[PDB]
Write an enzyme that holds these catalytic residues in place. Sequence first.
Site, PDB file in Angstrom:
ATOM      1  N   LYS A  31      -2.028 -34.735  30.592  1.00  0.00           N
ATOM      2  CA  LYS A  31      -3.369 -33.879  30.835  1.00  0.00           C
ATOM      3  C   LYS A  31      -3.164 -32.755  29.805  1.00  0.00           C
ATOM      4  CE  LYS A  31      -5.410 -36.449  33.718  1.00  0.00           C
ATOM      5  NZ  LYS A  31      -7.027 -36.974  33.391  1.00  0.00           N
ATOM      6  N   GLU A  73     -13.233 -30.006  35.764  1.00  0.00           N
ATOM      7  CA  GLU A  73     -13.178 -30.827  37.010  1.00  0.00           C
ATOM      8  C   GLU A  73     -11.691 -31.207  37.369  1.00  0.00           C
ATOM      9  OE1 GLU A  73     -13.966 -32.359  34.212  1.00  0.00           O
ATOM     10  OE2 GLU A  73     -12.349 -33.764  34.165  1.00  0.00           O
ATOM     11  N   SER A 110       2.752 -41.352  32.581  1.00  0.00           N
ATOM     12  CA  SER A 110       1.934 -40.452  32.403  1.00  0.00           C
ATOM     13  C   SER A 110       2.204 -38.989  32.840  1.00  0.00           C
ATOM     14  CB  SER A 110       0.586 -40.854  32.721  1.00  0.00           C
ATOM     15  OG  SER A 110       0.526 -41.165  34.093  1.00  0.00           O
TER      16      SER A 110
HETATM   17  C1  LIG Z   1      -0.513 -37.741  36.111  1.00  0.00           C
HETATM   18  C2  LIG Z   1      -1.661 -38.429  35.919  1.00  0.00           C
HETATM   19  N1  LIG Z   1      -1.541 -39.731  35.396  1.00  0.00           N
HETATM   20  C3  LIG Z   1      -2.769 -40.331  35.259  1.00  0.00           C
HETATM   21  C4  LIG Z   1      -3.917 -39.801  35.492  1.00  0.00           C
HETATM   22  C5  LIG Z   1      -5.183 -40.990  35.388  1.00  0.00           C
HETATM   23  O1  LIG Z   1      -6.181 -40.445  34.306  1.00  0.00           O
HETATM   24  P1  LIG Z   1      -6.097 -40.940  33.072  1.00  0.00           P
HETATM   25  O2  LIG Z   1      -6.596 -42.252  33.163  1.00  0.00           O
HETATM   26  O3  LIG Z   1      -7.365 -40.209  32.233  1.00  0.00           O
HETATM   27  O4  LIG Z   1      -4.724 -40.757  32.361  1.00  0.00           O
HETATM   28  C6  LIG Z   1      -4.093 -38.535  36.187  1.00  0.00           C
HETATM   29  C7  LIG Z   1      -5.672 -38.234  36.719  1.00  0.00           C
HETATM   30  N2  LIG Z   1      -5.728 -36.982  37.300  1.00  0.00           N
HETATM   31  C8  LIG Z   1      -6.987 -36.325  37.281  1.00  0.00           C
HETATM   32  C9  LIG Z   1      -7.995 -36.929  38.179  1.00  0.00           C
HETATM   33  O5  LIG Z   1      -7.659 -36.873  39.538  1.00  0.00           O
HETATM   34  C10 LIG Z   1      -6.835 -34.845  37.743  1.00  0.00           C
HETATM   35  O6  LIG Z   1      -7.821 -34.188  37.829  1.00  0.00           O
HETATM   36  O7  LIG Z   1      -5.800 -34.317  37.835  1.00  0.00           O
HETATM   37  C11 LIG Z   1      -2.879 -37.989  36.443  1.00  0.00           C
HETATM   38  O8  LIG Z   1      -3.155 -36.611  37.119  1.00  0.00           O
END
Ligand SMILES: Cc1ncc(COP(=O)(O)O)c(CN[C@@H](CO)C(=O)O)c1O
Lengths: 391, 388
Positions: free
Chosen positions: A82, A104, A368
Site C-alpha cells: 500500500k 478510505e 503483499s
Molecule cells: C496487506 C494487504 N494485502 C492485500 C490487500 C488487498 O488489496 P489489493 O487487492 O488492492 O492489493 C490489502 C487491502 N487492504 C485495504 C482494504 O481493506 C486497506 O484499506 O487496508 C492489504 O492491507
Amino acid sequence: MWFGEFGGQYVPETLIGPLKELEKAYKRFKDDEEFNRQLNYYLKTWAGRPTPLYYAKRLTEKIGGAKVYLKREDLVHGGAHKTNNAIGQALLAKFMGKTRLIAETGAGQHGVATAMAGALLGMKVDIYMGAEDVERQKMNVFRMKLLGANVIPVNSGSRTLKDAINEALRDWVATFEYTHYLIGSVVGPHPYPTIVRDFQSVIGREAKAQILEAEGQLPDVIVACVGGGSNAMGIFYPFVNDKKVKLVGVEAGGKGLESGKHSASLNAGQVGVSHGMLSYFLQGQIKPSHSIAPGLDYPGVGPEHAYLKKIQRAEYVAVTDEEALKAFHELSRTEGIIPALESAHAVAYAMKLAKEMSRDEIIIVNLSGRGDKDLDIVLKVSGNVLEHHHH
Amino acid sequence: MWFGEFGGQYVPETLIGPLKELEKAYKRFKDDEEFNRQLNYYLKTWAGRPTPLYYAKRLTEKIGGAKVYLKREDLVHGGAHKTNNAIGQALLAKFMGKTRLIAETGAGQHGVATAMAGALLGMKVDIYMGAEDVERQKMNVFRMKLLGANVIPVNSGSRTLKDAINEALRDWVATFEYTHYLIGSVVGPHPYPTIVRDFQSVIGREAKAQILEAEGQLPDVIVACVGGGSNAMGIFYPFVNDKKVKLVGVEAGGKGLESGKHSASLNAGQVGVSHGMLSYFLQDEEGQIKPSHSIAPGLDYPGVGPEHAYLKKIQRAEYVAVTDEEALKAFHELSRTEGIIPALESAHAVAYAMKLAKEMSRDEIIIVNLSGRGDKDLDIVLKVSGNV
Ligand SMILES: Cc1ncc(COP(=O)(O)O)c(CN[C@@H](CO)C(=O)O)c1O
Ligand SMILES: Cc1ncc(COP(=O)(O)O)c(CN[C@@H](CO)C(=O)O)c1O
Ligand code: NA
Ligand code: NA
C-alpha cells in the site's frame, strides 16, 4: 478510460471536474524528471525499495515441485505494498498544490500508509473508515492517530469499506481545491485504476529483473491475492505482454464459495456499475464481503482484472479461510516469514500449484504484507484449536 | 578477549572448551568465501539488506539546526537490527554442524530474530525468557511460537533477562556439542562481544557508503541507543578509526539518573563481573545485579558490553542518558513529522539527536541508528500516552 468493456467514469457532474484536473496533472507529472526524482528518492530512502525476491528453499523442497519465490512487499516501510501507491499519489497531490489527503480504509493498512505518506510530505490526513472496521482494527487506528491523522468513523449504511468510500467521495466533491482523495486500490472512476496500477507496477518491474538475475528466465506463474487488485496488478502488469508467464489472482474463498460468505467478486459476482466504474460486484444490492483476511473485504474488484479475466490472460481462483490460515502457519515455521493473512491466500494457492508442477519450473508469489497486524486474529483462532499438540 | 581492561572469559572450566571451539570455528569461517557468500545472500534476499539511510528533512527543518539522517534498521526483516546477528550466528552454528539454537531475550526482539533465523535454516530453537518478561511481551512470545520456537519461561531469581542468561549458560554447558548459544548483544564471555559486533558492523559499513553518496563527506556525529550495545557497536565500529566522527551512545535514563530507576550502566554503574565479562553493571553494596528500568523494553540488560566500557575509558565515544519522558516525546515526534514509528529503544537515540541537532550548525550532519520499528511498542504507548 476502459479495459475492454470494464472501468469507465460513471459519476455525477460534481466529480467530473475533480477527475479531469487529476487526469491532466497525472499526464503532466507521471514522466516529469523532477517528480520522478522525488518519487524514486522517497521509494528508495524512506520506503526501502527495492524489496528483495526470496527463494523459499525449504518450502520448495518440502512440496517437491516447482521453485517458489516470494516478492517481499512485507519489507516495504509500513509492512505492505500500500505504501508504494500512498507515496505516489501523495507526491502527486503535493505537486498539484493540495494540502490535505483523504482516504478510505477497511483493514487499516491503506489508512496507515496514507497517514505515513501525509506525515512525510507535511499534509493533513483524514481517514474514512467504517465503524465496524474501526472496531476490528484498534491498533491500526492507533497507528493512524500516532502518525498525525484523524480517523473519521463512518456510521452510514453497512458501516464497512463500501460506505467509507461513499463518504470520502462526498468529501472530495466539496474540498478538491485543496484535498486529494487517495484511493487505495485499482478501483473507482478513471483515472484511479490506471494511477494505482502504475504506482504499484514497480513491484513487477523489480521482480522481473530479480528473477532474470536469479534464474536466467521469466517465471512460469505469478500468484497474487486479489482484494480490489492493486498488489496483483502491480506484480502482473510488467509481465502482461510475456505470453510465457501465467498470471493467477487469488480471491478470498472465505467459508466456501457455496456458503455465500466470501469475497470472490470475479468468481461469483455480478457485472454492474458502482463507485464510478463497471466491474464485478458481490450481491440484489451490493453486500459486505467476508474473509479471515481483513484486507480482502472490498465487495468488488478492479476493472483491469475483469478485463484480464474476460480475455483469459489471467486466471482467477479462490482459497478458503482455513487454507489461508494453514499457509500463514506454514510460511512462518518453514521460512521464518510471518505473512499478512491477505498474502497467505496467495501462498496457499502457490503451494497447491507447486505440487502439480515440475522442479525446473518457477512460481513467484507476491507477499503483499507482513503478518504483525494479524497476530490478534491468529491468536484468537490458534487459542481455540482443539488438541493443538497432535494436529 | 580484552578491550583494555574490560571483557575476559569469567566462566567455569566447563564452558572454556565450548568457547574455545566457538573461537576456533569463528576465526575459520569469518573470512571463508563460502560462509560469507551464504551470509550475504540471506542478508540480501531474506533480511532485505541494505537498509536505506534516510534524510529526515522535516525534522531537520523543524529543529532548524544540523542535518538528521536515520539509518533504517527498522526496515530489516523482523523489524530490528537483531536479525543481522541472528542470521550470522545461526549460519555459523550450521557451519559448525550444530542442529539447535538457544537464546536469551528480554524485550522479545532477539527471541523473535533467533526464531526466524532458526526457522530459515531448519534448526530447533529454544528461547529462555524471564517469567516477568514473558508476561510483558505476549505478542513477541506468540511470534516466537508461530516461527516454530519453544519459549521456556525462567521462574528462578528475579525472573528477568539476567536470569534467562544464567539458564541459557546452564543449558549450553550440557548441550554444546549440538547446540549453539546465540547471544543477542555485544555481551558475555569472549568471543561473543567481538562476534556480535562483527555481525552488526554491516550497519556502519552501509551507513558510511550511503552518507558519502548522499553528502560527499563523513558525518559529524553518530548517535545510537545502548542496551547491551550491539546496534551502537554495529554503526560505530567502521567509523572508530575516522577521528573527526564523534560517537554518542544513549542509555536509558528511565525516571531519572538520581531516581534509582534507569538502565544507564556506563553513566551510573560500577565495574563488576557478570555473565562471563568484566564490564560496567548496575549492582548494589552486596555486589548483586540491580533491576533495570526503562519504558523501552529492549534497554533492560543491567550491564553493558566491554567494548563500550573501553570506548568510554579512552574517550573515543561519549555516553549520555535520555529519560522515559524524552524517549516517549521522540517516539511521537518522529511518527508525526516523518511518518516513521520508531522502536522505544531507538527513540532514545532520536531524542538525544534532536537536542544535539538544535545546538549544531545547519551544514553539519548527524546519523541516528534507528535500531527498530515501533509496532511491537504500540500497546505500551497506548497505555502510557493514552488513546487519542
Ligand atoms: C496487506 C494487504 N494485502 C492485500 C490487500 C488487498 O488489496 P489489493 O487487492 O488492492 O492489493 C490489502 C487491502 N487492504 C485495504 C482494504 O481493506 C486497506 O484499506 O487496508 C492489504 O492491507
Ligand atoms: C529494537 C531494539 N533496539 C535496541 C535494543 C538494545 O540492544 P543493543 O544495545 O544490543 O542494540 C534492543 C534489545 N532487545 C533485547 C534485550 O531486551 C531483546 O532480547 O530483544 C531491541 O530489541
Ligand atoms: Na472482492
Ligand atoms: Na544497560
